[PDB]
C-alpha cells in the first residue's frame, strides 16, 4: 500500500514525500517548482516538507503560491514545516516558547496557510528546558496552528525525555522523527528508531535517500556541471565527494550498478526502495530538480515488490556497514 | 542514569532510576527487550499484574546491588515463583536458598 | 414526557428526531425539505441529524438554508452531525485529528452554523489511536465548534475504551450513541447499550426505526414505484427485501397488522412506539419523504400509552428474536 | 471599609450593590434608570446585578445602554449576570453546556459587553450532572466571557459538590453565593454559609435586604399605590403581606420603629446595616425605584458603626427567629 | 557572552536592559526617547522594560510609537511589562483575575503590541489567593497575550508558594524575578535569590544598579540641577541623599573613585559590572536620561573582564555590607 | 482482555486486568452486575469502603487462580467477614478453614 | 452518605464516605468543627502530619462501628497517643486497655 | 511552617510540613543545602531511590521529636545503613543501639 500511517498516529502520508530544500526557491525556478508539484500531486504524493531556514524563507513563499493558484484542497495535502532558525537575532533561534509561537506564525503567512499539519523541531536546543518546548508545541496545536508535531535530528533519549514530559503535564507527545537514512547512514533508523516505535509510537520520516545526490551515481566521473555539488555555498558537498572516504563510496556504487541491472530498476530507484523496505520508515522525503528525476524516483514504488530477502542480503555485503544492536 | 522508570505492580507504584535497573542486564527489568511487552504507553509505566508485597524485596535487590531476602509476610512458595518471573538468575537463586537453608 | 435527556447529559432532546439521510438533498426537493422541517419544528421536534457523507455534502446545504430562511433561533434547535467521510483523498477519511478538525469546520460552512450541538464519530477507526480521537473531539468542543460528542456504531468495548482515555487525560467523554434499532435489529440496544447507560452514562439515539421502510409494510406486494428500494444505487435494499430472509420478515409484518388493528394505530406508528418503550433509548431518528408520512409518524407518541406489558409480550412472540443477556 | 473582597477571591466589591430586578426595564423608566446608576456610581457602588430572565431580557438592555452612554470604564464596574432561564424552548433552560455557553453569549450582546465579571447559576438543575455545569462554567471563563462564577440558591451540599468536581478535574470552583437574607430569612446565611466560607472560601452576596419592600414598613396601612405589591403579576407579594403570617411581621416592624428612633436611622437603613453586621456577608444587593430610596439606603453605611452588640441583642429579641446550629 | 538566558528558560536576553521609568514619557522628550532606543538597539540591547503605572500609562505610549516608527521586528525585541496599578478604582489594583486580564489588555493597546514577552506582577497582593494569580497569569499566556511571566518584589517564600501552585494545578510557573540590586542593596540577590535559582529555576533581572543615580557619584556636592532628585514629586530621593545615612554613602563613593581610577572605568561603569559579576543575575535594567549616560553604561561590559577576584574583595571592604547566609 | 479495572479499597488503589477478575464469574468482582453498584464514574474506579489489608489476599486469590491465604496481620474474625462480602463461595471458604485448621 | 472524605496521613491517603465518619459525632473526625482546621482546600483533603501505620486501625474503628485494635507493628506507647489525638473517647479507650490487658 | 515538603522514597510518597523537618537542622532532611541535590523540579518533590520500609521510622523520628525505633520487618544491617544516609547523627545513633542492645 502506497499510503501509510505516520507512527501510530492517524495521519496517513504517502510513502514518498517532496522536499523544498535547495531546489525550491533556490536552485530551480518558480515555473519548474509549479510543474514538479503538479507531477507529484497527480501521482498520489500528499507530503510536502519545507522549513523557514530554507532560502531565507523564500522556499515557503514558492510553495505557498503553488497551493493558492492550483486551488488544491488543503484537506488533501499534508504540509510540514520546521522551526529552529528564524534569523540573525538571538531571540530568533532555538526552541523557546517565543520562537516556536513567532516562527510558526511567521511561516503561516509565507505559506499563506491557516495551519500546517506537522511542525518539526528542526534540531534539539540545549539552552531550553524540555518543559518549555513541549508546552510551546502543545500551545500551537491547541490554538490550531498545527495538528501534530515531530522532532528532527533528536537523540532517542531526547525523544524519550520529551515523551515523559508530555505524560507528566498532560501535554501532546511528538508523533514523528526526521532522520537521515540512506545506504551510507544506517545507525539511527535501524537501531535507535525501531525501539522507539514499538515503545511509545514514534515513526520515522527519513530524508536524503540519495545522500544529496551521491547515491544516484552521477558523481563517478568528477563533478558534473549544474548539479548540487557545483552550486554556490555547497563546498561541504564537494569536499565530501572528492575526499578519500567519498571516493571509496563511488567504488561501491559501481558494484551496485550490477544489482540494479539484474532488476529492471536504476540506482536512484534502488536506493529509495531500499529505504522503504522496512515497516519502521513511514515516509521518504525526495529531492528533485527536474521532471525526469521526479518521474524516475516515483518509479521506485514498483521496485519495492522486486526486493526479496536475497537482494537485501546482497546489497548489505556490498555496503559493508550494517549496524549491530 | 537520571531517567526514572515507574514500575506499577498491580496498582502499587515503584519509581527507580534507570541506571539502577541497568546494573543487572540479564534480568527482566534490566533487559529493555524483555520488559518491552509490559510498557503502558498511555501512563508511561511498566505494569505487572503480579504479587504486591514480593516486589519490594525484588526492587531492593537492584538498589543494594545483589542483596535480596524474603519479606517476613511473603511465604516461600509465593516468593520463589517471583524470583523465577523477574529472572534474577540461577546464581542469585542459590544464594537465596542457602540463606533460607533450603 | 416528550422531551427527554440524552444519556445522563443536560441536553434535552425530543423523543422523535428528523434525519436527512437519502431524502434531504437527494430524493425529495428543496421545497418539500422546507415543508417537512416546518411540520416537524411546529410539532416540538428539535433534533435534526445530518452528516457530511450524505449526498456528497448537499444534505447539509439544504438543512443550512432552511434555518436561515425560517429564522429559527439556534437555541431552540439541536443540530447534530457525523464526521467520518470527507472525500476521495486518504487524509479525508477516518477519525484523525486532521479530519475531525477539518471535516467539522467544513460542515459548519455548509450548515452556515457557528457551532453544532453533537458531533458524531460516524464509525470507528482502527487506524487511529483512541487518544487522538478523544483529544480531537475535546479540541473542537473547547474551541466552541461543538457542545457534545457521541459515537456511531461503536461497540461497547470501544465506547468504554474512549471513556477511560477521557478520565485518564482529563478530556471529555462521549454522551451518546447511535445504534440501529427496529423490530429486526435488537442485540445492541437491549443487551450492550443498557449496561453502558447505568455504568458511565451513555444514552442511545436510535436510527432507522422502520428499517429503511421495510417495517412500514409497503413492500409486501413487491417493490412499489417511487420508494427508496427503487432509487438509484440502492440495490442493497432491494436485495434485502426480495431475499428469502427478507421475504420471511414480510410474513411477520402481516401478523403485526392484526396487533396494529387491535390498537388504533398503524404499523409505522406501532414500530416507532415500540422503539420508545424503554427508558434507555433517548431518541428515535425518523425518516420521512412527504408530509403524510411525517404526520403519521409523529402520531406514534399517542400509541406509547397504549402499549401495555401484554402487547409487548404479544409482539415479541410474533418477532421471535428477543436477545438473551 | 466600604470595599470588601468577594469570598476569598481577589474581586473587590462594594458593600452595597444595585439590582435590576423589577425596577429596571420594568417598573421605572429608562431615564430614571440612568439617574439611579449615576447616583450609585458616584457614591462608590461598583456592583450592578442583572439577569437574562428579568423583563424577558429587557433589563440587560437598559443597563447596557447606560454604560455606553455614561462612558464608564469597564474596569471600574463589576457587572454580574444570572443564567438559568433563556426562553420557552426546552433547550433554553437549565445549566446544560448548551445553555450556559449559549445563554451567556446572548446576554453579552444585550449588555453590549465583552465580558461580565461573575456569571451566576440562578438556581440548581437536577437534570444535569455537576461535571457538565462546572465544565461549562470553566469554559466561558477560559474563553474570556466571564472572570468568576457563582451560584444562586444552591444547597451548601450542592456548593460542596461543585467544589469537589473542580478539584477532581482541575476546573474552576465558584467564588460566591447569592442567598436571601433579611430579618425574616436567616437560616442559610447564618448557619449554612459560614461553614462554607471558612472551609472552601465561598462568600455570600445577599439579595432582598428589605424582603421586596416589606421591611421598609410601608405596608403597615394596607397596600399603598404605585408600590411593588400593586404591580401586575405580583399577587404572590400581596398574598404574602396580607396573610396572617404576614400581618404578624408588620406587628414586629412597629416594635422596630422604636429601635430605629433610638438611633438616628430609619427602618430601611436599619434593615440593611443589620445585614452587613457580619464578616460573612460580602455584599448586599439593593433595590431602588427612585432617587429618595437609593439615597436613603446608601445612608445605611453610617448606621453600621452605630450597631453595638447590645442593639443586635435587642433586635433579635423582637424578631424571635435566631437560628440554632 | 553578552546574551544570556533568563533563569533556566529559553528566553535569551541581553545583559543590559533599558527601563522606561521616569525618563520615558516623564523627564525626557519623545525625540530623545527615540534616540536612546536606537542607540540601545544598535548596541545589542533587546530588553525594554515598562509598566502601566509609569507616567499614568504615558510611558508605554512613547515606547509603543518607537517600535512602529523604527519598524523593528517584534521577534528581535524582548518587551516586558508590569501589572499592579491600573488606576483609581478599587477593582483596578491588585493581582486579581479581573485586573491581570484587563490591565494587560489595556497595556497591549498603548504599546500597540499583539503580545508582551514577560508580564510581571509588580508587587505581591495579600488580598488575593495565589491560585487566582497563577491561574490568571496562565490564562494570559495561553490566550497569547504573554509568553512568560515573572514577579517583582516577591519574597522567596511567595515565589516558592507560586511555584507550588503551578505544579499542583498544572499551571505555568514564573521564570523571573525583579529585585533591587546595587552596592547598597545586597540581601535578596546574594542570599535569597541564589537558592531559588538552583532549586526551581528562577533568575533575577535586577533593577536600579546606580540606586536612582546615587552610585554615579553626581550627588557628592549637593543636589545638581536637572537630575532626578530635583524633579517634581521625588522628595523621597532628596531625603535619601541628604540624610545622615545617605551622607555616609557618598563618603564611600569617594573611596570607590580610587578603585575606578585603577581600572580604566568610571564609577557608573564599575557599579554596573559589579552587578553582572555573578551567574545568578540574568540582566540589569539601566536608566538613562541622555545619550552620554547610555553610551557610558554600555561601556560597562568591557569592565567585566577587568574585575578579578581581588577587586571584588577590595570593593566589599569599602562597602562593608556583605550579607551572611 | 487488556482492559484494566481499578479497584479502590478505602483510598488504596489496586489496578488489575479485566481477564483476571473474570476468571471467577460468580464472585462480586467477577460478575459485572454485582460490582455495578460500586463504580465511581467520575474517577473510573470501583470504590469499596472496606478493610484495607484484607484485600491484598483477596486480590491475589484471582491472580494466582484460587490460592488464598490469610495475611499475618489480619485476624480471623476480620478476614472471614471479608470472604463473605467478596463472595468467594462456599467452596473456597472450606479450603480456607482447613488450611486454618478450623 | 454518598460524599467521600479524603484523609491524608503524612502522604498516605485514606478515602471514606462521610456517613462513616459521622457515625461517631464527638470524635475529631466526626465533628466538622473539630476537623475544620486540618482541611487543605487546594487539594480537597484533610491533612494530618501524624503517625502513618496507626491510622488504619483508627479508620477501621469507624467502618466496623467500634471495633478497634492495635496493629501488630505499632507499639503501645505510640498507638495510645493516637487514640487521644483522634479523640475516640474515654469509653472506647477502656475497651482498648481490657483487650490489651492494661 | 505551613509549607509541606513531599518526599518520594522510590515511588512511595510521604508529605510532611517544613517546620517538622526543620526541627533538626544538621540532618540531610533538615539542612536545605544538603537535600538540594535530591529535588525533582518537575514533580516538586524530593526523590530518594532508597529503601522503602526504612523511611517510615525515619519520618516519625522528626514528627515525634527524636523517638526513632527500628521497624519490625527491617533488619539491623539494612536499617543502620539508612540512619547513616539520612545523617541522624552520632548522638541519635547511640540512643538507637542501646535500645537495640548493641
Ligand atoms: N534536517 C532535516 O530535517 C532535513 C535536512 C535536509 C533535507 N531534508 C528534507 O529532505 C529533502 C532533501 O533530500 P535531498 O534533496 O537532500 O537528497 P535527495 O537524496 O533527496 O537529493 C536529490 C537531489 O539530488 C539529485 N537527484 C535526485 N534524483 C536524481 C536522479 N534520479 N538522477 C540524477 N540526480 C538526481 C537532484 O538534482 P541535482 O543533483 O542537480 O541537485 C536533486 O536535487 C528536502 O526536500 C528536505 O525537505 C530535511
Ligand atoms: N450511521 C448512522 O449514524 C445513520 C445511518 C443511517 C441513518 N441515520 C439517520 O436515521 C435517519 C434515517 O432513518 P431511515 O430513513 O433509514 O429508516 P426510517 O425507518 O427512518 O426510514 C423512513 C423512510 O421509509 C419510508 N417511510 C417512513 N414512514 C413511513 C410510513 N408511515 N408509511 C410508509 N412509508 C414510510 C419513507 O418513504 P420511502 O419508503 O418512499 O423512502 C422514508 O423515506 C436518517 O435521517 C439519518 O440521519 C443514521
Ligand atoms: N435569585 C436571585 O438571585 C435574586 C432574586 C431576587 C432579587 N435578586 C437581586 O436583589 C435585588 C432586589 O432586592 P429586592 O428589590 O427584591 O428587595 P429590596 O429589599 O432590594 O426591594 C426594594 C424595592 O422595595 C422598595 N424600597 C426600597 N427601599 C425603600 C425605602 N427606603 N422606602 C420605601 N420603599 C423602599 C422600593 O420601591 P417599591 O416598593 O415601589 O417597589 C424598591 O423597588 C435585585 O436587584 C436582584 O438583582 C436576586
Ligand atoms: N519595581 C520594579 O520592578 C522597578 C522599580 C524601579 C525601576 N525599575 C526598572 O529599572 C529602571 C530604572 O533604574 P533606575 O533608573 O531607577 O536607577 P539607574 O540606577 O537605572 O538610574 C539612572 C538614572 O540616574 C542617572 N544616571 C545614569 N547613569 C548615569 C551616568 N553615567 N552619569 C550620571 N548620571 C547617570 C540618569 O540621569 P538623571 O540623574 O538626570 O535622572 C538616569 O536617569 C527602570 O527603567 C525600570 O524599568 C523596576
Residue numbers in the entry:
A (entry chain G), C (entry chain A), D (entry chain C), E (entry chain E): 37 to 361
B (entry chain H), F (entry chain B), G (entry chain D), H (entry chain F): 31 to 132
Q: What did the paper state?
A:
To obtain maps with a higher local resolution, we performed particle subtraction, followed by additional classifications as well as 3D refinement on the cytosolic and transmembrane domain independently. The additional two maps showed higher resolution for each domain (3 Å for the cytosolic domain with local higher resolution as high as ~2.5 Å, and ~4 Å for the transmembrane region with local higher resolution of up to ~3.0 Å), which we used to build models of the Kv channel. We built three models for the Kv chimera: one for the cytosolic domain, another for the transmembrane domain, and a third hybrid model that combines the two models which fits in the overall 3.3 Å resolution map of the entire complex. For the higher resolution cytosolic domains, cryo-EM densities for most of the side chains were clearly visible, we could resolve density from the NADP+ cofactor bound to the β subunit and densities for bound water molecules in areas where local resolution was better than 2.8 Å. We do see a slight shift/rotation of the cytosolic region of the α subunit and β subunit with respect to the transmembrane domain of the α subunit when compared to the crystal structure, with the most pronounced changes in the β subunit, likely reflecting the lack of contacts between molecules that are present in the crystal of the Kv chimera.
Voltage-activated potassium (Kv) channels open in response to membrane depolarization to conduct K+ ions, a process that is critical for electrical signaling in neurons and endocrine cells, as well as muscle contraction. Kv channels contain voltage-sensing domains that activate with membrane depolarization, and a central pore domain that opens to conduct K+ ions with high selectivity. The X-ray crystal structure of Kv1.2, a mammalian homolog of the Shaker Kv channel, and those of the Kv1.2–2.1 chimera containing the S3b-S4 paddle motif from Kv2.1 (Kv chimera), serve as a structural framework for understanding the gating mechanism of Kv channels. Since no structure has been obtained for a voltage-activated ion channel in a membrane environment, in the present study we solved the structure of the Kv chimera reconstituted in a lipid nanodisc environment using single-particle cryo-electron microscopy (cryo-EM).
